[PDB]
């Protein structure tokens, strides 16, 4: 076999809440904030 696609370009910091992608880490934090806050119970039925 032949594979190895780990090293083409430059890693990036993408959000883990929504799934957005950013070039810089700090820049991402400024966004992730939007997620910072309260969250729903979960079992919300309806």
> Closest distance between Zn ion and the C-beta of residue 9, in Å?
21
Please check whether residue 14 is in contact with residue 28, taking contact to mean a CB–CB distance below 8 angstroms. yes
> Closest distance between Zn ion and the C-beta of residue 33, in Å?
9
Q: How much helix, strand and coil, in percent to the nearest 5, is found in the chain?
A: 25, 10, 65
Q: Which of residues 1-40 bind Zn ion (CB under 5 A)?
A: 15, 17-18, 20
Please tell me the count of residues contacting Zn ion according to CB under 5 A.
Answer: 4
Q: How far apart are CA 4 and CA 25, in angstroms?
A: 25
Which residues would be at the binding site for Zn ion (CB under 5 A)? Answer: 15, 17-18, 20
């Amino acid at each position: 076999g032949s594979s190895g696609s780990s090293g083409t370009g430059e890693r990036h910091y993408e959000c883990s809440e929504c799934g957005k992608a950013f070039i810089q880490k700090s820049t991402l934090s400024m966004h992730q904030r939007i997620h910072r806050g309260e969250k729903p119970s979960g079992p919300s039925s309806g």
